[PDB]
């Protein structure tokens, strides 16, 4: 699947919705074809790989044990309740899979709030005992770079990977192990509606003339003030982001946001 030449990536899917994988497919300059043909060697990825079953399992083994080393990118939380049985691949629990593979990686990137912090399945009452990667595997000394969001901006993944390949090290990380180059500012301090906030000019409802005029969404629940992400700067799909579409930020790059940021339409 790999040898010399391009750096090997092993991409794992735990308890996830595949939205994080889809975000990577939206990569722009570079595009995903450049990334998998020129930049990297994508050596395991269940969503798009040709092999299935036993052949897929052999491809993973081949990649993980390569003397050339690999980077792991992980999507989804690890279900730990009931000895991990809520999530299995190839009839191995995800806990067991990640426990075996991730300590072998040269670097691990937890991609998306589920892998970083536990995410949607970790929300109360957390029936599957879903944990983020670093929480789940702290005892094995795994320290994944956390690229948060639901899903993250794929700019932030590519940027992290490129940095790592160049510098052979992680970039500066915040106290949630997120790169400060992407997560160092709140959404709010970058928001175009900030002057309305300052002026106490809030939309009271989505149907209101104030909402039509682009007033601040704080009264309607906006969690921009407490959310670290680069959304207003980079935008999504080269064209938009939630507040410019008229909807509050739901805080999706923060830990425990499903429970901390709810009810989403209140502040």
């Amino acid at each position: 699947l790999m040898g010399p030449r391009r750096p090997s990536v092993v991409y794992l899917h735990n308890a996830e919705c595949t939205g994080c994988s889809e975000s990577v497919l939206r990569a722009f300059e570079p595009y995903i074809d450049t990334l998998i043909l020129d930049t990297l060697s994508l050596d395991y990825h269940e969503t798009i790989m040709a092999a299935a079953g036993d052949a897929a399992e052999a491809a993973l083994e081949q990649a993980v044990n390569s003397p050339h080393g690999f980077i792991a990118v992980v999507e989804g939380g690890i279900p730990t309740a009931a000895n991990g049985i809520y999530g299995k691949v190839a009839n191995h629990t995800m806990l067991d899979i990640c426990s075996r593979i991730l300590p072998k990686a040269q670097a691990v990137i937890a991609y998306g709030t589920c892998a970083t912090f536990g995410g949607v399945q970790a929300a109360k009452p957390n029936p599957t005992g879903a944990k983020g990667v670093n929480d789940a595997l702290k005892h094995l000394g795994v320290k994944a770079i956390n690229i948060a969001g639901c899903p993250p901006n794929p700019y932030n993944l590519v940027g992290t990977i490129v940095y790592y390949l160049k510098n052979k090290a992680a970039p500066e990380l915040d106290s949630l192990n997120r790169p400060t180059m992407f997560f160092g500012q709140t959404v709010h301090e970058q928001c175009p509606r900030l002057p309305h906030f300052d002026a106490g000019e809030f939309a009271p409802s989505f149907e209101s003339e104030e909402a039509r005029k682009g007033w601040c969404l704080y009264e309607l629940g906006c969690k921009g003030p407490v959310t670290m992400n680069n959304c207003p700067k980079i935008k999504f799909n080269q064209t938009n982001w939630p507040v410019d579409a008229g909807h509050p930020c739901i805080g999706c790059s923060e830990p425990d946001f499903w429970d901390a940021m709810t009810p989403f339409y209140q502040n």
Partner: protein
Amino acid sequence: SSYSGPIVVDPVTRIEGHLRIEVEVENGKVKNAYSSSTLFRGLEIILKGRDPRDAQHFTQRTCGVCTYTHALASTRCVDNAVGVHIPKNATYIRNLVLGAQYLHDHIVHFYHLHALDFVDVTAALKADPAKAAKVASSISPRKTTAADLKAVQDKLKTFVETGQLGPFTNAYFLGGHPAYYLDPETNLIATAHYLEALRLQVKAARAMAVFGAKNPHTQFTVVGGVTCYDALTPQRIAEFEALWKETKAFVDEVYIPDLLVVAAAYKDWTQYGGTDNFITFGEFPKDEYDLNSRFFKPGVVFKRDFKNIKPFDKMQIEEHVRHSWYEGAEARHPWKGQTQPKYTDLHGDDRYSWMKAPRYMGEPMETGPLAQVLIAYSQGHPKVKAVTDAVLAKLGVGPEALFSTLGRTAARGIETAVIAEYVGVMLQEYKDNIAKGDNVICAPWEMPKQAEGVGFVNAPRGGLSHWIRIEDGKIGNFQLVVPSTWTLGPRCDKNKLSPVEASLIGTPVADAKRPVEILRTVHSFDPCIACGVH
């Protein structure tokens, strides 16, 4: 030289989510099958007690492939519960975003999930690019030259010669495979378009972000309508329209001709993976409270009796748990649903999946593009009839051909073509409405303390329904019944095989170590296991 014994495919790749397929093979043909879904998250449990307005944000995360669809279903469900009638422009904008989702989803499915079951990418290196160009220019109004295709071949050659095959590592076609039929030139055409589709899908997804904030996981729906005042502007409408136009051109000039060239080479696939019963909910309403106002209408068909389409009665849905990892054996209507996990391991107490088994009037129902297309055809849908008949005539097959894996795959293309054109119609209607002076996109509403609601979406994989019971103004019960639940769920308490299971019976397997034939059928249903299980 025909195998007897089990075959397990775990993981089934090139799907969303975590699926294990088990079959029994007798003399080279499948005689039995199990569809085992091996991840549970429990979103229904998590939602209990929460603000109904929050449901769409959680349930959207059911799935990032069929992103937006669950936000739409939940918002339709809570709109319905509170009795709000959203403005015409909110219906148009929600419909336009949904149409764009179908185009993105089906293009990615055909190329990036399904096609490696049928295309030997490495055989493309032995192709004659001039012969390939002529072939490609004969099937499409888009003219392709030898140099065009040589560029792809050169890139692939470099990639393959590095020995780092990446996503093609251990592919079932490496070394040759008796079930892979295409000539080198047709492989090269399909491989070129696989690669092209990787960039085109960026634009198809962008179309959703124009009005919908971002893809994946849109953020423009609210109870009562939508939030995106900017979507009223001529600039955003122009931006959408341009992306839609380019996406439709790709559908028309690249995807459908490729679908037809591959289907013609695999015409034996008309003989495998048929199903008996079909359910569809309709999509693209004029009236959010009348399914029969939708461009595609709802319906139910039993045992392929398309002369006798039955009305869809939402009270005849029950979800079984007898062969699922939940407590007990009692099927429930989703307004009385239960999500009580109880794992017994594979086939423990005859249970083998985290999916429930939805049954309609006790029967297992295929849903998705084949259901939507066949039922619309049978209802006289003129656009569906026109495209379907042209596809049939081009392939030289009769309508019986559609009841198969090839049929299903063709139906996905048919629906893509029809929806790509209908997006233009919706767009114009939207423009017309704005021009009338209607600039309203959200309606006021009030939260009842007690209510029941349901929202229906016909998503790219079929009939999606979200069901709420509001108690004390909070979520008392929230149940998702998802298209892949219908199609890939397990057996019910009457032991009836699900559509996927039944469809697999009779599958030939040439090489049990490389069971691409099983993949062809399973992939034709476009499984989404995060969806099916939630």
